Amino acid sequence: QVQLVESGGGLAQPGGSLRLSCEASGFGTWFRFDENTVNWYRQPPGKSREFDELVARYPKSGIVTYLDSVKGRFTISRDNAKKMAFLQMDNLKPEDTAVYYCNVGEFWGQGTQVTISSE
Amino acid sequence: GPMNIINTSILNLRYESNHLIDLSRYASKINIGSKVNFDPIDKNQIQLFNLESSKIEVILKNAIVYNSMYENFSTSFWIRIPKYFNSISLNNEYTIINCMENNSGWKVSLNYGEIIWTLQDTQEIKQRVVFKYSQMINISDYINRWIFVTITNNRLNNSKIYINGRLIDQKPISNLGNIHASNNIMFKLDGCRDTHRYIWIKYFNLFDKELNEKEIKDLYDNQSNSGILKDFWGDYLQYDKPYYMLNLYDPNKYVDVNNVGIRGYMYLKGPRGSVMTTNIYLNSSLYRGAKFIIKKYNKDNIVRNNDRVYINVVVKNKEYRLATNASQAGVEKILSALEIPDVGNLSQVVVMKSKNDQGITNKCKMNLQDNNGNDIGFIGFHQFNNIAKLVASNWYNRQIERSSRTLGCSWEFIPVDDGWGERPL
């Protein structure tokens, strides 16, 4: 009866931008959102989840790390009172096409498709 | 407190009165970059990232800059290394502690499943000593868990690496001539291709002699801080923190509840299941089963040896109380998850244990008692027909004394940690 629900993905053009969002709901009082790390992962097209890439990580320490290919283009953030996480994705490239997942602690969103259409 | 050999060590990097400094007689200067994380619960625990400003530099006093053909020396520290999860880490040796400059000196480096010591003279004669650990393993003693590293160097014979107070490997260094190390020591991930890689490190020391095995074992015991309970990763066990349970006697099961209330019971359910990334890791899933939460019966949230406690259990997003009716003939007392307001006169107070009165350590963590300090028994399990029900039993208490071996009452508390990520099952 707990869930991570993702939104904000879909289709975009190269050079364009999207913002993914993720919301943690239903969690009992034992669950402290502020104590949990928020991650965004993505699954490369044509590969299984074993090929998942860690796109961005925002731990409680606040020291953020990014996948090399998205440095300077993507920005991760979090809202502890709203129990939300965000992935701002700028200057998109065809190779950014993937299913993206929000991960908070040991909990996961279902995945959101992002598709970047070339010219 | 700290051992004499620590108090007289030539570099003794510790957190003191709100800063990380050298406690040695030499008081070497420490420069700390802007992206170094100090664990708020235990500020001696230092996290270093794959970022340029995540570094600590020691400016060695001239008197202890290594320049010799004969002087023996050693280093000790604890390290916690997150599980490798990207194929980019497979064949990627990266330095983490650097005292190698202009082709001579020493360094500690890491690679996939490896801790490496490198020593080199001014003629560039080199020796390497390595500790290897696997990521293809059900339950690892090493992956993402605090381990104690000790490296000793005897200029007339061998360099040795120890892990957790025990000798792993050794290699001859007697062919090495003059070793002239760096004027500085840089703690920094250097040449790591995994942009998310980090390490935790604590209690770094340098010694101007070859530590013997007794000294190393003593350092290990002392720095283990055995009066404080630990979680699976080796951090301090805490109150009000969700832990997944792992029974060391039967690791291939997780804790579940058939039904809540005194008519239901806690049991180990299997199989636990695995997590895998081909060619990178294959392990038991750790984040499984009903979470235990440790509840106060000191204001710092750290769980200490002999602390009396209640155990809460999370079932279907709700907290319940571990309890039992101990008034029956059977020595094994089946544990149930009760509605907290409805526990009544049932037995529920648990004494947390890390070691006994003589200082001997044991993995049996939970000794259930009545309300007047009388033993009911350590919490473990017992097979009833086909069902491994959670149980409190004084048989355990009698076994703890005679032998040091793993028992049904041996548990690990596993909190969710950045160095061990699992895809959802």
Coordinates of C-alpha atoms in Angstrom, one line a residue:
Chain A
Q1 CA 0.0 0.0 0.0
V2 CA 3.0 2.2 -0.6
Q3 CA 4.0 3.6 -4.0
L4 CA 6.4 5.7 -6.0
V5 CA 4.6 7.4 -8.8
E6 CA 6.5 9.0 -11.7
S7 CA 5.4 11.6 -14.2
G8 CA 6.7 14.2 -16.8
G9 CA 8.3 11.9 -19.4
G10 CA 7.3 11.2 -23.0
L11 CA 8.4 12.5 -26.3
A12 CA 10.8 15.3 -27.0
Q13 CA 13.1 16.8 -29.7
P14 CA 16.9 16.9 -29.6
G15 CA 18.1 20.0 -27.8
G16 CA 14.8 20.2 -25.9
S17 CA 14.2 19.7 -22.2
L18 CA 11.9 17.6 -19.9
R19 CA 11.4 17.4 -16.2
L20 CA 10.7 14.1 -14.5
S21 CA 8.9 14.0 -11.1
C22 CA 8.5 11.3 -8.6
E23 CA 6.2 11.2 -5.5
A24 CA 6.4 8.9 -2.4
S25 CA 2.9 8.1 -1.0
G26 CA 1.2 5.8 1.5
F27 CA 4.3 5.2 3.6
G28 CA 3.9 4.7 7.4
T29 CA 5.6 6.7 10.1
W30 CA 8.4 4.2 10.3
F31 CA 9.6 5.6 6.9
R32 CA 11.6 8.8 7.1
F33 CA 11.9 10.3 3.6
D34 CA 14.7 12.7 4.6
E35 CA 16.9 9.8 5.6
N36 CA 16.5 8.1 2.2
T37 CA 18.7 8.6 -0.9
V38 CA 16.9 9.6 -4.1
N39 CA 18.2 8.2 -7.4
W40 CA 17.3 8.3 -11.0
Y41 CA 18.2 5.2 -13.1
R42 CA 17.7 4.6 -16.8
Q43 CA 17.5 1.4 -18.9
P44 CA 19.3 1.5 -22.2
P45 CA 17.0 0.6 -25.2
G46 CA 17.3 -3.0 -26.3
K47 CA 18.9 -4.1 -23.0
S48 CA 17.6 -5.7 -19.8
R49 CA 17.5 -4.0 -16.4
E50 CA 20.9 -5.6 -15.8
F51 CA 22.2 -2.7 -18.0
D52 CA 20.5 0.0 -15.9
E53 CA 22.7 3.2 -15.6
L54 CA 22.6 5.4 -12.5
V55 CA 21.8 8.8 -14.0
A56 CA 21.9 10.9 -10.8
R57 CA 22.1 10.4 -7.0
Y58 CA 21.0 12.8 -4.3
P59 CA 21.9 11.4 -0.8
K60 CA 21.0 12.9 2.6
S61 CA 24.6 14.4 2.7
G62 CA 23.6 16.6 -0.3
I63 CA 26.7 15.5 -2.3
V64 CA 25.3 14.8 -5.8
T65 CA 26.9 12.6 -8.4
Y66 CA 26.0 12.2 -12.1
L67 CA 26.5 9.8 -15.0
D68 CA 29.4 11.2 -17.0
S69 CA 27.3 11.6 -20.2
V70 CA 24.7 13.8 -18.5
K71 CA 27.0 16.1 -16.5
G72 CA 26.1 19.7 -17.2
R73 CA 22.8 18.7 -18.9
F74 CA 20.8 17.0 -16.2
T75 CA 20.1 18.3 -12.7
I76 CA 18.6 16.3 -9.8
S77 CA 16.6 17.7 -6.9
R78 CA 14.3 16.7 -4.0
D79 CA 11.6 18.2 -1.7
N80 CA 11.5 16.4 1.7
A81 CA 8.3 18.0 2.9
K82 CA 6.4 17.1 -0.3
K83 CA 8.2 13.7 -0.5
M84 CA 9.2 14.4 -4.1
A85 CA 12.2 14.0 -6.4
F86 CA 12.9 15.6 -9.7
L87 CA 15.1 15.2 -12.7
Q88 CA 15.6 18.2 -15.0
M89 CA 16.9 17.0 -18.3
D90 CA 18.3 19.6 -20.7
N91 CA 19.9 19.6 -24.1
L92 CA 18.6 16.2 -24.9
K93 CA 20.2 13.8 -27.3
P94 CA 18.9 10.7 -29.1
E95 CA 21.1 8.6 -26.8
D96 CA 19.0 9.8 -23.8
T97 CA 16.1 7.7 -25.0
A98 CA 15.4 5.1 -22.2
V99 CA 12.9 4.0 -19.6
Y100 CA 13.7 6.2 -16.5
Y101 CA 13.1 5.1 -12.9
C102 CA 12.9 7.0 -9.6
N103 CA 14.4 5.1 -6.7
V104 CA 14.0 6.2 -3.1
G105 CA 15.7 4.0 -0.6
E106 CA 14.7 0.5 -1.5
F107 CA 11.5 1.6 -3.3
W108 CA 11.0 2.1 -7.0
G109 CA 8.8 3.8 -9.5
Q110 CA 7.4 1.6 -12.3
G111 CA 9.4 3.4 -15.0
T112 CA 8.7 6.3 -17.4
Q113 CA 9.6 6.2 -21.1
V114 CA 11.5 9.2 -22.5
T115 CA 12.0 9.3 -26.3
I116 CA 14.2 11.7 -28.1
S117 CA 13.4 11.9 -31.9
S118 CA 16.3 12.8 -34.2
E119 CA 16.2 14.8 -37.4
Chain B
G1 CA 40.7 4.5 25.0
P2 CA 43.2 4.3 22.1
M3 CA 46.2 1.9 22.4
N4 CA 49.7 3.3 23.3
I5 CA 50.9 2.4 19.8
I6 CA 48.1 4.6 18.4
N7 CA 49.0 7.5 20.8
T8 CA 52.6 7.3 19.7
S9 CA 51.9 6.6 16.0
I10 CA 53.5 9.1 13.7
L11 CA 50.2 10.1 12.0
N12 CA 47.0 9.7 13.9
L13 CA 44.1 11.2 11.9
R14 CA 41.1 11.7 14.1
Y15 CA 38.1 13.9 14.6
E16 CA 38.7 16.1 17.7
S17 CA 36.6 19.0 19.0
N18 CA 34.8 19.7 15.7
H19 CA 37.7 19.2 13.2
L20 CA 39.7 16.4 11.6
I21 CA 43.3 16.8 12.7
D22 CA 46.5 14.8 13.4
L23 CA 46.7 13.8 17.0
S24 CA 50.3 12.7 16.8
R25 CA 53.3 14.4 18.4
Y26 CA 54.1 15.8 14.9
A27 CA 50.8 17.6 14.4
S28 CA 51.0 17.4 10.6
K29 CA 48.7 19.9 8.8
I30 CA 45.5 18.6 7.2
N31 CA 43.8 20.4 4.3
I32 CA 40.2 19.3 3.7
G33 CA 38.4 19.9 0.4
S34 CA 34.8 21.2 0.1
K35 CA 33.1 17.9 -0.9
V36 CA 34.2 15.7 1.9
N37 CA 31.3 14.2 3.9
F38 CA 31.7 13.5 7.7
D39 CA 29.1 11.0 9.0
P40 CA 26.9 13.0 11.5
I41 CA 26.6 10.0 13.9
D42 CA 30.3 9.3 13.9
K43 CA 32.4 12.1 12.4
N44 CA 35.5 9.9 12.3
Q45 CA 33.8 8.3 9.3
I46 CA 34.9 10.1 6.2
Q47 CA 33.3 9.8 2.8
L48 CA 35.4 10.6 -0.3
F49 CA 33.7 10.9 -3.8
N50 CA 34.9 10.9 -7.4
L51 CA 35.0 14.7 -7.4
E52 CA 38.0 17.0 -7.6
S53 CA 37.2 18.8 -4.3
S54 CA 36.6 15.6 -2.4
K55 CA 40.0 15.1 -0.9
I56 CA 42.1 15.3 2.2
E57 CA 45.8 16.3 2.0
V58 CA 48.3 15.6 4.8
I59 CA 51.3 17.9 4.8
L60 CA 53.9 15.7 6.5
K61 CA 56.3 17.2 8.9
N62 CA 59.9 16.9 7.5
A63 CA 61.0 14.6 10.3
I64 CA 58.6 11.9 9.2
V65 CA 58.9 12.1 5.4
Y66 CA 60.0 8.6 4.4
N67 CA 63.4 8.5 2.9
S68 CA 65.3 5.3 3.8
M69 CA 66.6 1.9 2.7
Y70 CA 66.0 0.3 6.1
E71 CA 63.2 2.0 8.1
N72 CA 60.3 -0.4 8.6
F73 CA 56.8 1.2 8.6
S74 CA 53.1 0.3 8.6
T75 CA 49.7 1.8 8.0
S76 CA 46.3 0.9 9.3
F77 CA 42.8 2.2 8.6
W78 CA 39.2 1.0 8.1
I79 CA 37.5 1.2 4.8
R80 CA 34.0 0.6 3.5
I81 CA 33.8 0.0 -0.3
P82 CA 30.5 0.2 -2.1
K83 CA 29.5 -2.8 -4.3
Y84 CA 30.8 -2.4 -7.8
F85 CA 27.9 -2.3 -10.2
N86 CA 29.1 -0.9 -13.5
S87 CA 31.2 -2.8 -16.1
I88 CA 33.3 0.4 -16.3
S89 CA 34.8 -0.7 -13.0
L90 CA 36.1 -4.1 -14.1
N91 CA 39.6 -3.3 -15.2
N92 CA 40.1 0.1 -13.5
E93 CA 42.8 0.5 -10.8
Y94 CA 42.4 3.8 -9.0
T95 CA 44.5 5.3 -6.3
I96 CA 42.8 6.3 -3.0
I97 CA 45.7 7.0 -0.7
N98 CA 48.7 8.5 -2.4
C99 CA 52.3 9.0 -1.1
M100 CA 54.0 8.2 -4.4
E101 CA 55.8 11.0 -6.1
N102 CA 58.6 11.3 -8.7
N103 CA 58.7 7.5 -9.1
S104 CA 59.2 6.5 -5.4
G105 CA 57.0 6.0 -2.3
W106 CA 53.8 4.1 -1.5
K107 CA 50.2 4.1 -2.3
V108 CA 46.9 2.3 -1.6
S109 CA 44.7 1.7 -4.6
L110 CA 41.5 -0.2 -5.4
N111 CA 40.1 -2.1 -8.3
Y112 CA 37.1 -4.4 -8.9
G113 CA 37.1 -6.7 -5.9
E114 CA 40.6 -5.6 -4.8
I115 CA 42.6 -3.6 -2.3
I116 CA 46.2 -3.0 -3.5
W117 CA 49.4 -1.8 -1.8
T118 CA 52.2 -0.6 -4.0
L119 CA 55.8 0.2 -2.9
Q120 CA 58.5 1.5 -5.1
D121 CA 62.2 2.5 -4.8
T122 CA 64.2 5.3 -6.5
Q123 CA 65.4 2.8 -9.1
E124 CA 61.7 2.0 -9.8
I125 CA 61.9 -1.5 -8.4
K126 CA 58.3 -2.2 -7.5
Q127 CA 56.3 -4.6 -5.3
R128 CA 52.5 -5.0 -5.0
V129 CA 50.5 -6.8 -2.3
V130 CA 46.8 -7.4 -3.0
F131 CA 43.7 -8.4 -1.1
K132 CA 41.0 -9.9 -3.4
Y133 CA 37.3 -10.4 -2.6
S134 CA 34.5 -11.8 -4.8
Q135 CA 31.2 -10.2 -5.7
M136 CA 29.9 -13.7 -6.8
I137 CA 29.0 -14.8 -3.3
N138 CA 25.8 -15.4 -1.3
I139 CA 26.7 -13.2 1.7
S140 CA 30.0 -11.3 1.7
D141 CA 32.2 -10.4 4.7
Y142 CA 33.7 -7.5 2.7
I143 CA 31.4 -5.9 0.1
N144 CA 30.2 -2.5 1.5
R145 CA 31.1 -3.5 5.1
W146 CA 33.7 -1.8 7.3
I147 CA 37.0 -3.8 7.1
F148 CA 40.2 -3.2 8.9
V149 CA 43.3 -2.9 6.7
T150 CA 46.8 -3.2 8.0
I151 CA 49.9 -3.2 5.9
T152 CA 53.3 -3.7 7.3
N153 CA 56.7 -3.3 5.7
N154 CA 60.0 -5.0 6.8
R155 CA 62.8 -3.7 4.6
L156 CA 64.8 -6.8 5.1
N157 CA 62.1 -9.2 4.0
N158 CA 58.4 -8.9 3.3
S159 CA 55.5 -6.5 3.0
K160 CA 52.3 -7.9 4.4
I161 CA 48.6 -7.2 4.1
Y162 CA 46.1 -8.0 6.9
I163 CA 42.4 -7.8 6.8
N164 CA 40.4 -7.7 10.0
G165 CA 43.5 -8.6 12.1
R166 CA 44.4 -11.6 10.0
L167 CA 47.2 -12.2 7.5
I168 CA 46.1 -12.3 3.9
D169 CA 49.2 -12.2 1.8
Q170 CA 52.8 -11.2 1.8
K171 CA 55.5 -10.4 -0.9
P172 CA 59.3 -9.9 -0.7
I173 CA 60.6 -6.3 -0.8
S174 CA 64.2 -6.9 0.2
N175 CA 65.3 -6.1 -3.4
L176 CA 64.0 -2.6 -3.0
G177 CA 66.7 0.0 -2.4
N178 CA 66.1 3.6 -1.2
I179 CA 62.5 4.5 -1.0
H180 CA 61.8 8.2 -1.0
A181 CA 58.1 8.9 -0.5
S182 CA 56.1 12.0 -1.1
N183 CA 56.1 15.0 1.3
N184 CA 52.4 14.7 1.3
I185 CA 49.6 12.1 1.6
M186 CA 46.6 12.6 -0.6
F187 CA 43.3 10.9 0.3
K188 CA 41.4 11.2 -3.0
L189 CA 39.9 8.9 -5.7
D190 CA 42.4 9.2 -8.5
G191 CA 41.8 7.7 -12.0
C192 CA 38.5 6.1 -11.2
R193 CA 36.2 5.9 -14.2
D194 CA 33.0 5.3 -12.2
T195 CA 31.6 8.7 -11.6
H196 CA 29.5 7.5 -8.7
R197 CA 32.3 5.7 -6.9
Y198 CA 33.1 6.7 -3.3
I199 CA 34.8 5.2 -0.2
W200 CA 34.2 5.5 3.5
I201 CA 37.4 5.6 5.5
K202 CA 38.2 6.0 9.2
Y203 CA 41.0 5.8 11.8
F204 CA 44.0 6.3 9.5
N205 CA 47.4 5.7 11.1
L206 CA 51.0 5.5 10.1
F207 CA 53.6 3.7 12.3
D208 CA 57.4 3.9 12.1
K209 CA 57.9 0.2 12.6
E210 CA 56.6 -3.2 11.4
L211 CA 53.6 -4.0 13.6
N212 CA 53.5 -7.5 14.8
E213 CA 50.5 -9.8 14.7
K214 CA 49.6 -9.3 18.4
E215 CA 49.6 -5.5 17.9
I216 CA 47.5 -5.7 14.8
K217 CA 45.0 -8.0 16.5
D218 CA 44.9 -5.7 19.5
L219 CA 44.3 -2.6 17.2
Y220 CA 41.5 -4.5 15.5
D221 CA 39.8 -5.4 18.7
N222 CA 40.2 -1.9 20.2
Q223 CA 39.0 0.0 17.2
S224 CA 36.0 -2.3 16.8
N225 CA 34.3 -0.4 19.7
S226 CA 32.7 -3.6 20.9
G227 CA 30.6 -2.0 23.6
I228 CA 28.4 -0.6 20.9
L229 CA 26.2 -2.8 18.7
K230 CA 26.8 -2.7 15.0
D231 CA 24.6 -3.1 11.9
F232 CA 25.5 -5.4 9.0
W233 CA 27.7 -2.7 7.4
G234 CA 29.6 -2.1 10.6
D235 CA 28.0 1.2 11.5
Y236 CA 26.6 1.9 15.0
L237 CA 23.3 0.1 15.5
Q238 CA 20.6 2.8 16.1
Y239 CA 17.2 3.2 17.7
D240 CA 14.2 4.1 15.5
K241 CA 15.9 2.8 12.4
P242 CA 14.4 0.2 10.0
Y243 CA 16.5 -2.9 9.6
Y244 CA 16.0 -6.0 7.4
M245 CA 17.0 -9.1 9.4
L246 CA 19.4 -11.7 8.3
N247 CA 19.7 -14.9 10.3
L248 CA 23.3 -16.2 10.1
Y249 CA 22.4 -19.8 10.8
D250 CA 19.9 -19.9 7.9
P251 CA 20.8 -17.0 5.5
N252 CA 18.5 -18.3 2.8
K253 CA 15.4 -17.2 4.6
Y254 CA 13.7 -13.9 5.6
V255 CA 11.4 -13.0 8.5
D256 CA 7.7 -13.1 8.0
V257 CA 4.4 -13.1 9.9
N258 CA 1.7 -15.6 9.1
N259 CA -0.8 -13.7 11.1
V260 CA -0.7 -10.9 13.6
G261 CA -1.7 -11.4 17.2
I262 CA -0.9 -14.1 19.8
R263 CA -2.5 -16.8 17.6
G264 CA 0.0 -16.0 14.9
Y265 CA 3.8 -16.5 14.8
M266 CA 7.0 -15.1 13.4
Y267 CA 8.9 -17.5 11.2
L268 CA 11.7 -17.6 8.6
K269 CA 10.4 -17.9 5.0
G270 CA 12.4 -19.0 2.0
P271 CA 13.9 -18.6 -0.3
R272 CA 15.5 -15.2 0.2
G273 CA 16.2 -14.7 -3.5
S274 CA 19.2 -13.3 -5.4
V275 CA 20.3 -10.1 -7.1
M276 CA 22.6 -10.2 -10.1
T277 CA 24.2 -8.1 -12.8
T278 CA 25.9 -10.5 -15.2
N279 CA 29.8 -10.5 -14.9
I280 CA 29.6 -8.0 -12.1
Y281 CA 27.8 -9.4 -9.0
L282 CA 25.6 -12.3 -7.8
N283 CA 24.4 -12.1 -4.2
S284 CA 21.6 -12.9 -1.9
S285 CA 19.0 -10.1 -1.7
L286 CA 19.5 -8.3 1.6
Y287 CA 16.4 -6.1 1.6
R288 CA 13.8 -8.8 2.3
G289 CA 11.3 -9.7 5.0
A290 CA 9.6 -7.8 7.8
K291 CA 11.7 -4.9 9.1
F292 CA 12.6 -4.8 12.8
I293 CA 12.8 -1.4 14.5
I294 CA 14.7 -1.0 17.8
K295 CA 12.8 1.0 20.5
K296 CA 14.1 2.7 23.6
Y297 CA 12.9 1.2 26.9
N298 CA 21.3 8.6 26.8
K299 CA 19.9 10.8 24.0
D300 CA 22.2 9.9 21.1
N301 CA 20.2 7.0 19.5
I302 CA 23.1 4.6 19.6
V303 CA 22.3 1.1 20.8
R304 CA 24.8 -0.1 23.4
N305 CA 25.7 -3.5 25.0
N306 CA 23.2 -4.5 27.7
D307 CA 20.6 -1.8 26.7
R308 CA 17.1 -3.0 27.4
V309 CA 14.8 -2.6 24.5
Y310 CA 11.5 -3.3 22.7
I311 CA 11.6 -4.7 19.2
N312 CA 9.0 -3.4 16.8
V313 CA 8.2 -5.3 13.6
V314 CA 6.8 -3.8 10.4
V315 CA 4.0 -5.8 8.9
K316 CA 2.1 -4.5 5.9
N317 CA 3.2 -0.9 6.5
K318 CA 2.3 -1.1 10.2
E319 CA 4.3 -1.5 13.3
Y320 CA 3.7 -4.3 15.8
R321 CA 5.4 -5.6 19.0
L322 CA 7.6 -8.7 19.2
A323 CA 6.2 -10.7 22.2
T324 CA 5.5 -14.1 23.5
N325 CA 3.7 -16.1 26.2
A326 CA 6.6 -17.7 28.2
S327 CA 4.5 -19.4 30.8
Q328 CA 4.3 -22.8 29.1
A329 CA 6.3 -26.0 29.5
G330 CA 8.2 -25.9 26.2
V331 CA 11.7 -24.3 26.5
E332 CA 11.2 -22.8 23.1
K333 CA 8.9 -19.8 23.3
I334 CA 7.3 -19.0 20.0
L335 CA 7.4 -15.3 19.1
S336 CA 4.4 -13.4 17.8
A337 CA 3.7 -9.8 16.5
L338 CA 1.2 -8.2 18.8
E339 CA -0.8 -5.0 18.5
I340 CA 1.3 -2.7 20.6
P341 CA -1.5 -1.5 22.8
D342 CA -2.5 -5.2 23.4
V343 CA 0.9 -6.7 24.6
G344 CA -0.3 -6.7 28.2
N345 CA 1.7 -9.0 30.6
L346 CA 3.4 -10.8 27.7
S347 CA 7.2 -11.0 27.7
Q348 CA 8.7 -8.3 25.4
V349 CA 11.7 -6.6 26.9
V350 CA 14.9 -7.6 25.1
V351 CA 18.5 -7.1 26.2
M352 CA 20.8 -6.2 23.3
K353 CA 24.1 -8.0 23.4
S354 CA 27.4 -7.4 21.6
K355 CA 29.7 -9.3 24.0
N356 CA 29.6 -11.0 27.4
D357 CA 30.9 -10.0 30.8
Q358 CA 34.4 -11.3 30.1
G359 CA 34.6 -9.3 26.8
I360 CA 34.0 -12.3 24.5
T361 CA 32.0 -11.3 21.4
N362 CA 29.0 -13.2 19.9
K363 CA 26.6 -12.6 17.1
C364 CA 23.6 -13.5 19.2
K365 CA 22.1 -10.1 19.6
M366 CA 18.8 -10.3 21.4
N367 CA 18.1 -11.9 24.8
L368 CA 14.4 -11.6 25.7
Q369 CA 13.7 -11.2 29.4
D370 CA 10.9 -10.7 31.9
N371 CA 10.5 -7.2 33.4
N372 CA 12.9 -8.0 36.3
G373 CA 16.1 -8.8 34.4
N374 CA 15.4 -12.6 34.3
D375 CA 16.4 -14.5 31.1
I376 CA 13.8 -16.1 28.9
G377 CA 16.3 -16.8 26.2
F378 CA 18.1 -15.5 23.1
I379 CA 16.0 -15.0 20.1
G380 CA 16.5 -17.5 17.3
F381 CA 14.3 -20.2 15.7
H382 CA 13.1 -23.7 16.0
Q383 CA 11.5 -26.1 13.5
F384 CA 7.9 -27.0 14.3
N385 CA 6.9 -29.7 11.7
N386 CA 7.8 -27.8 8.6
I387 CA 7.9 -24.3 10.0
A388 CA 11.0 -22.5 11.3
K389 CA 9.2 -20.3 13.8
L390 CA 11.0 -17.5 15.6
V391 CA 11.7 -18.6 19.1
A392 CA 13.3 -17.4 22.4
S393 CA 15.2 -20.2 24.1
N394 CA 17.5 -20.5 27.1
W395 CA 19.3 -23.4 25.3
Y396 CA 21.0 -20.7 23.3
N397 CA 22.2 -18.9 26.5
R398 CA 23.9 -22.1 27.6
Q399 CA 25.5 -22.5 24.2
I400 CA 27.0 -19.0 24.1
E401 CA 29.4 -19.8 26.9
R402 CA 30.9 -23.0 25.8
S403 CA 31.4 -22.2 22.1
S404 CA 32.0 -19.2 19.8
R405 CA 30.3 -20.8 16.8
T406 CA 27.3 -19.4 14.8
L407 CA 24.0 -20.3 16.3
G408 CA 20.3 -20.0 15.5
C409 CA 20.3 -16.8 17.6
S410 CA 22.9 -15.1 15.4
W411 CA 21.5 -12.1 13.6
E412 CA 22.5 -9.1 11.4
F413 CA 20.5 -5.9 11.1
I414 CA 20.7 -4.5 7.6
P415 CA 19.6 -0.9 6.8
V416 CA 19.2 0.3 3.3
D417 CA 22.6 1.8 2.2
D418 CA 24.0 3.6 -0.9
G419 CA 26.8 1.1 -1.2
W420 CA 24.3 -1.7 -1.8
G421 CA 21.5 -1.0 -4.3
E422 CA 19.0 -3.6 -5.4
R423 CA 16.5 -3.7 -8.2
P424 CA 13.0 -4.4 -6.9
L425 CA 11.9 -8.1 -6.6

